[PDB]
Symmetry: C3
Subunit: 406 residues, 3 copies
């Protein structure tokens, strides 16, 4: 029988029970609380390790497969769908957080473009560029944190060059095609340890909860994120699928249910990629030619739920700080949330790593992310589920939009 | 019709007009002055990004093509020509700057050798090694700045090993041959954006000029650099070509005019490399076998005008500081200027990145480079033009010196 | 005739004579003492440069050759032998140092596992992770020092994936097979300069000796390390070879004498790898299929003398500090010494780079390594000789244990 979904479901329920029991029956110091989540920490180390080779190989392989000029229309449709759906998600999140009200910008805007074109490839693999005004000259320095956005841009450009280069670049096509397969196999190996890591990751989160009052304080913020993700994944995505594809969207989701369930459990759109491939290709009978580009590329660029979560969380933290947001502040939040979703990886907690960028877009303190850390696991799992669902609908939508080409 | 040369010439003239008009009619603060050069800044980020893959692939591919022992004579002639002509340029620059007078060394000497053999390959991709006396033990630490010299040495050694390794290393030959072609294609893609970047780079430089008095103060220094570059490119280089090649050198230059013009506009010996290839192969009917090694390798090692500029500028800054230079100080300046030209990339402003090394050779402050920043663009464009011209003459000279081998 | 062994023997004796004469007849300041060892320093820079490509290619190539499931038994036998013999060495060293008595642990224990799975591949190439308690939250930061252990784990996992991936990963097999051959050729090129570097490395060590009193102070510690290494290489290793292989072990050592002699001279188990290959394959008629995996992999993981030296030196420094070691302290020293031997490279002085980890396991100051630096060269040469001998016996032992498979 299948072991992944079950093992992970058992891990999640065991994590809930372990967290509850340990938090109440026992009293652990900060030390023991940190040491109790060590297996989950090691899982994060392994997943963050696979980020860089996975992204580089996936982007290069995906865009190099679409070598033909006619095949490039498939890529054009995919990128416009990714941007359009992510923009819709950001708009929906901002509107909802403004309505419910649960609670140096140019430097960050230019830092987005600066990080889109890193000065060094090797440095971009593990470092990012940030500029700050001072006396008013601009001083920019590199800080830790993989430059996922710059790596993505170079990988897409490099893969396009390799595909157009023809047989001269066939060695590089094969090199990166094998490197993507090998990285996916390593992710599958990580899947063996994932259940235990997820157990101690979920349990570790519950232990850090102090007196259950923080969930009440963040309940309205949780409601805003959850309602936004729900609307996006149950109305907007099915609706757009119906307009482009004259087929039942909910049947499409039911055919891709195992992938969404796995995403909602492991909270990784890249680790669930094999499941996403299998579901779309087998149950939905989607063409392999468009899937092999839409799914792996969209697993990293197309992150709609993360974009919605970034927008809602940034506005909510601002509202907590009692900083009234103007039109330009809303616009800059929208752009940085779109960039943050693009620049965030498909790993658990990737949402929090790029959250500081959107927070600093409006001058908010970097450490203000701690205001929503406590309830991040539940929101992270859901935003990932919808993240994969966005790509899931894109596969069928791109297939319909490219029927003649295939 | 051709678009590059024209587009870039229009960009340069538009930059002059934009700079003049903006500097006089309008008054911009330091902030707006920095933000006005942002498109040029992004061009620098893209060009600096391509530095590392371009150099690594170019060196490995160039020296791996000359696999045969007989073919290794071609490489030997090329390297001796590069060193000899660069040494002549340094001597000419030092003599001129001493005559006109426009105005811890062992640690730097040993740091050259230390950086020739970096401790880490990945660190050398983005960091450099420097040692300083203190209490007198020596303390060495790594600092930011790509170790271009160490990467060059490893790439040459690695490429030699790959070429001699025969069919066992053929996969690596092909891998790096495709990687060089792909990097050149990415540079060609950058050429699309270059015109706008050059416009805002030239315009941005003029804005930073305060009251036009700095050009008068540096006029004699500009004259020394310009006369030195002129002499080197119109007397020494044509003369040596005549001794080795019994042909008209100025006709050779007229056949390679489009490459020199493009270099004088874009200020990059590596970005103009496709033009240099086309001119030498088509107009001058130079053999492709020797061109494919002399041009790409010489685009990074053989930088004669930069060597002349480094020597003249280092001595000129010293003269400004009223530090009387001894014989040993002149000798150490010559060696570090040769190393700096070798270690500087083929990008706009590469001359200034390695200038700190030669300045610190004589104990001068690192921030003293600011004394010649204002007039750097004009000198940078000319020194690049002669840089490409040095390689241009080397192609024909190496062909003549290897007539029997071909 | 052969030049390596002789040239290096002449270099060692010339280093002894140069060190003695320079130390006594002349009086050199700290400056001149440091500058006198510069050629040896450059040798260290070159060898440390080759560490990373050598290890990565060696591990991947070694474990990818054993693609077959039946062939994986060979790898299983090799790894269990490496661990078992290293554990025996650590136990022997601890017992001897406790008997003779020549003189935050959980954080280091968890740091071993954290570094086994680095967060970034590129960062692991040149940086390591360390955590420290403070106010008690845990704060972890990355520091300089190549993460050899994390690179080894990823390389082994990656190579296993590539081997199992079949013909899809054949391009990567060939890429890393050529990269290993090229790296070995570069090491052979370094062998040309090694004699001079070893001369100034040995001479430089003798100069730093102050008044010959430090050797007397560390004489008992030197005796403990030397007796432990002797016992391990003349009793334990020959005995275990006899149990598994019903052949004369000392004849096996006499057949591999040139490799042990070269190791005792150059103090590098990786630079002597070509000699180890030649001796085992020619004189001992060992099968090439098992040698090509046991030797290159064991040159980096299987370091028994280093493990013994790490344990003895850590306990000896602790004894100097008058810190009474409990059972748990001994156990944590044993584990960290095993990890340190695994994580240390096959270069001269690799023992000292990972010594700080085992020292900090028991809270000892990092700079306490200076207490045994003076006499490190002699101990380093011997521990390397036995390091290669451990792998030497493993080749024959693994061959006997896999007779049916071959
Ligand atoms: N959970 C990640 C991204 C995030 O957490 O924001 C994903 O797979 O989409
Ligand atoms: N301009 C660079 C080098 C420099 O600026 O010094 C070149 O292409 O030669
Ligand atoms: N000498 C190294 C390791 C060490 O010095 O500890 C070796 O080759 O084994
Ligand atoms: Hg949680
Ligand atoms: Hg200028
Ligand atoms: Hg010594
Ligand atoms: Na989207
Ligand atoms: Na996704
Ligand atoms: Na993303
Ligand atoms: Na030259
Ligand atoms: Na050049
Ligand atoms: Na150069
Ligand atoms: Na061992
Ligand atoms: Na070894
Ligand atoms: Na080791």
């Amino acid at each position: 029988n299948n072991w992944v979904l079950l093992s992970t479901v058992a891990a999640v329920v065991l994590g809930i029970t372990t967290g509850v029991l340990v938090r109440e029956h026992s009293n652990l110091s900060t030390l023991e609380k940190f040491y109790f989540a060590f297996p989950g920490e090691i899982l994060m180390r392994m997943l963050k390790l696979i980020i860089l080779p996975l992204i580089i190989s996936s982007m290069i392989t995906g865009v190099a497969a679409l070598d033909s000029n006619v095949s490039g229309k498939i890529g054009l449709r995919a990128v416009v769908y990714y941007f359009a759906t992510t923009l819709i998600a950001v708009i929906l999140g901002i509107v909802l957080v403004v309505s419910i009200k649960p609670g140096s910008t140019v430097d960050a805007m230019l830092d987005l473009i600066r990080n889109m074109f890193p000065e060094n490839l090797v440095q971009a693999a593990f470092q990012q560029y940030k500029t700050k005004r001072e006396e008013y000259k601009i001083v920019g320095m590199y800080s830790d944190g993989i430059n996922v956005l710059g790596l993505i841009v170079f990988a897409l450009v490099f893969g396009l060059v390799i595909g157009k280069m023809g047989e001269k670049g066939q060695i590089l096509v094969d090199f990166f095609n094998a490197l993507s397969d090998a990285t996916m196999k390593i992710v599958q190996i990580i899947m063996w340890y994932m259940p235990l890591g997820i157990l101690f990751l979920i349990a570790g989160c519950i232990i850090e909860v102090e007196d259950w009052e923080i969930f009440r304080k963040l309940g309205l913020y949780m409601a805003t994120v959850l309602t936004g993700l729900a609307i996006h994944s149950i109305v907007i995505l099915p609706l757009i699928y119906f307009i482009v594809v004259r087929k039942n969207p909910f049947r499409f989701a039911m055919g891709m249910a195992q992938a969404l369930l796995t995403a909602l459990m492991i909270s990784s759109s890249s680790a669930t990629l094999p499941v996403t491939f299998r579901c779309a290709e087998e149950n939905n009978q989607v063409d392999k030619r468009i899937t092999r580009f839409v799914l792996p590329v969209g697993a990293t660029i197309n992150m709609d739920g993360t974009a919605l979560y970034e927008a809602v969380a940034a506005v909510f933290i601002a509202q907590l700080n009692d900083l009234d947001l103007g039109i330009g502040q809303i616009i800059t939040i929208s752009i940085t949330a779109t960039s943050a979703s693009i620049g965030a990886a498909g790993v658990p907690q990737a949402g929090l790593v790029t959250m500081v960028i959107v927070l600093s877009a409006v001058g908010l303190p970097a450490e203000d992310v701690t205001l929503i850390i406590a309830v991040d696991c539940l929101l992270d799992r859901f935003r990932t589920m919808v993240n994969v669902l966005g790509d899931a609908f894109g596969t069928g939508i791109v297939e319909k939009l490219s029927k003649k080409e295939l």
